[PDB]
Amino acid sequence: PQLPDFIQNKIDHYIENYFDINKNGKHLVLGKQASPDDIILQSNDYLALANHPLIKARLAKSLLEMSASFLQNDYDKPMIEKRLAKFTGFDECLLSQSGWNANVGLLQTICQPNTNVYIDFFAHMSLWEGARYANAQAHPFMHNNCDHLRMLIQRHGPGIIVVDSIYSTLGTIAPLAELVNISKEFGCALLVDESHSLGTHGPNGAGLLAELGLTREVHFMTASLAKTFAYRAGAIWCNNEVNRCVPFISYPAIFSSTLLPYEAAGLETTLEIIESADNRRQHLDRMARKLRIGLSQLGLTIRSESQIIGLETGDERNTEKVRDYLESNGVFGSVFCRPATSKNKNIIRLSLNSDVNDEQIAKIIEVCSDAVNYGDFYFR
Amino acid sequence: PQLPDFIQNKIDHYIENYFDNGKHLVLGKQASPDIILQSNDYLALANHPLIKARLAKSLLEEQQSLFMSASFLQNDYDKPMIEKRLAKFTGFDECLLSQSGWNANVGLLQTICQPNTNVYIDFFAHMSLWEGARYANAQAHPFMHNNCDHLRMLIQRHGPGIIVVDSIYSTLGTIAPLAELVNISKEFGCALLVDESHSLGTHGPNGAGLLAELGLTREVHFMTASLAKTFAYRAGAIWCNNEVNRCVPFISYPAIFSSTLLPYEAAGLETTLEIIESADNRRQHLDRMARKLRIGLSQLGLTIRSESQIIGLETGDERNTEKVRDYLESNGVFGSVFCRPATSKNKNIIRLSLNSDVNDEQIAKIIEVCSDAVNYGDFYFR
């Protein structure tokens, strides 16, 4: 069944502009296959728990032996939710099938058509789309720029301020204390996506809001559980009654199948391990700082203040060359391009984890040092 | 933190209008070791020992810390063998795993739609298909349920587009006129997208589905399915008789911006597929039981549009639905309430979902409890 022109034309154009132009004829994100022991810095499994014996054992144990809307009775709602709410310090926690669904569902629940959503330019796409599905009025503010935000809120009125605590591509940290004050001053609600700080930051890994003592003045916190928690799920935390309504309003919550009951059990063991992982956190924080200092001195713009390090590689042609150079020299990050970034502001993201070595860190710096001197490409 | 007026008032209003029984309409009383008809696990595989053992097994040895987007795993050697197996199973050229049936539909539509694109969608097609088109800013043209004449007129007026249907409808359990839909697609130069969430596994040769049963496979451009029904797993799939699945992983937002299934999950699906392929007797049994329940209920004067294992009791408005729900539950029948936003406010449906573990004795009892209800008084049916 040949495709009709209206689809074929679109697919043809796409393949030509997104696959064919690259030297390997594949999408820009697709590079060389890695070998042992190349340095792989692509996983969001920050505390390296993917293969943890206890988590795996607990999961299998539980798995041996419909919509979640129908499971909102007290006796149907999972114990992990209460533990996660306690862990973080928020009043209530609601599980979701992914961080994406957590954001989209929360925003569908608290937004009306035309609701003002003040969203950081670099906040996760799931937050942008969540607002758009709700037909909210999106007001993008320049990255971490509170002056710009103040102007927008002054102009458009009360609404929801939406940020990542730690940004997924750049590794920058939101000015959370100032955001809290801005929301108080302007009568806004604050939504913080802690996908990249939950587990890696704060007391026992409770996160950035916890570390800063801001938990009790933030209305909503969300997180993918597919980062430090190493599980395909998400969660919504509320310091209010909103989680009572989400399960019956959010489309992903209504129209998409729920997490199975054994999945919640695996999360309980993961939480316990995370709570105790002080040394892994410490080691990761140290290694990330060593990397940031090492790369910055090379003249690369390194905006990161976290375990996420963004190499700024400009346009797609330049980006292909950079990542080809890195991979050829045993360093494997993740290419972030359109539609995640502007077509001319690509990022090669280095995601550090607690298994990374001092020797590996020095090696990354060495490779990037050579890269800067090579003359085949540039960094921004 | 005090919520802003705009949010607090929304929550307060919702709670009074949808909760104030005390709970949401979909929540009734707790059942007992009662007849449950709420699970989409049509062949009752949720506890199959072989599947659990295989999942458990692969679940040990995760050198693959692959916590990242599936877009980064689109090299040959990273793509799961379950995709090739599912493609071969159904007869389609290519298959692509998704995190859910919802995501499969949203993703496919984002990939094949431009803002101008005509989307001809059955009025009762799943919400994920409606939303998929809407997110893509497509021009949706709904046709009356299973009404090929209406569809024809619409395409005549607006031109080539994407025809979107469920093979078996999730609320009413009716069956799309797939053979005629294929003819219409050919006649007007459209593409066909069929969601087989409720027919994959339960219908066709070895459960390959309705398109396979009707020999329409090679004539259809796209098929999608939740794997959370007969496959008893939290995932979805897109099948293509073309190169569209080459592009979906880099275009679909849910595919780009949400984490992939873990490798051990795909392994479990392989075993599920093998069990389903050999489940002839279970399919036979479910088909025969569903027919009995349908016949049984249609005697009584009840509107039973279903032609499948999904039976919808049409209970009208919300007040009336609550009453029917309660009556059924008190008599040991459960019982899935479909209301807004899934249905219109005054066209609620209490869906009876059958599975291969239901027996003759239970069917008879369901018929009886419904016979009593019609009419023991108290409420009406549409």
Ligand SMILES: Cc1ncc(COP(=O)(O)O)c(CNCC(=O)O)c1O
């Ligand atoms: C800040 C943020 N929020 C939400 C999500 C979505 O989470 P789920 O994958 O559970 O749907 C992501 C995904 N981040 C993907 C990455 O950084 O590679 C994210 O980075």
Ligand SMILES: Cc1ncc(COP(=O)(O)O)c(C=O)c1O
């Ligand atoms: C016809 C149909 N398509 C898609 C879906 C969504 O499937 P999933 O729960 O895997 O997101 C559903 C399930 O509700 C459905 O009934």
